Ligand binder design. Structure first.
Ligand SMILES: *C/C=C(C)/C=C/C=C(C)/C=C/C1=C(C)CCCC1(C)C
Length: 137
């Protein structure tokens, strides 16, 4: 099954609460929530190799990984981490993150392709889960 495509966000829930856990002050949280409403995700999937480009109006980032192989990226609030993605089912994967330096909330993310053709991303910090839903452009 295939995540490849150009995805545009239709719903973003609990993102402010996630950023709050991660220590972001209120004005930056509000501006970040607004930036998230413009989020686009481009995915190229080849077997278990993924190329992902996530962008908003003024920023773009590339995430490249192979399932089961450690890689480096950043947490949501922007701290370098070591990440490891595993499948949880046919169309859902889970990424566990570990800070390269220092300490903080336990963070992770998941990506799921639903039977109805939506892409669901969750991002977690401790007890707080943000859910974002995308459809194909
Ligand atoms: C498989 C898809 C993944 C791993 C998507 C990750 C997306 C992010 C880490 C998005 C982060 C953003 C911020 C930290 C604030 C600016 C707006 C976002 C939503 C692009």
């Amino acid at each position: 099954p295939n995540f490849s495509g150009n995805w545009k966000i239709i719903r973003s829930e609990n993102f402010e609460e996630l950023l709050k856990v991660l220590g972001v002050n209120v004005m930056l949280r509000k501006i970040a929530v607004a930036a998230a409403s413009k989020q686009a995700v481009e995915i190229k999937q080849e077997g278990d190799t993924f190329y992902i480009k996530v962008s908003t109006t003024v920023y773009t980032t590339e995430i490249n990984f192979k399932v089961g192989e450690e890689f480096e990226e950043q947490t949501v609030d922007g701290r370098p981490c070591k990440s490891l993605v595993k499948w949880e089912s046919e169309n859902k994967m889970v990424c566990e993150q570990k800070l390269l330096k220092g300490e903080g909330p336990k963070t992770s993310w998941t990506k799921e392709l639903t039977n109805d053709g939506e892409l669901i991303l969750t991002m977690t910090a401790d007890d707080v889960v943000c859910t974002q839903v995308f459809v194909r452009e």
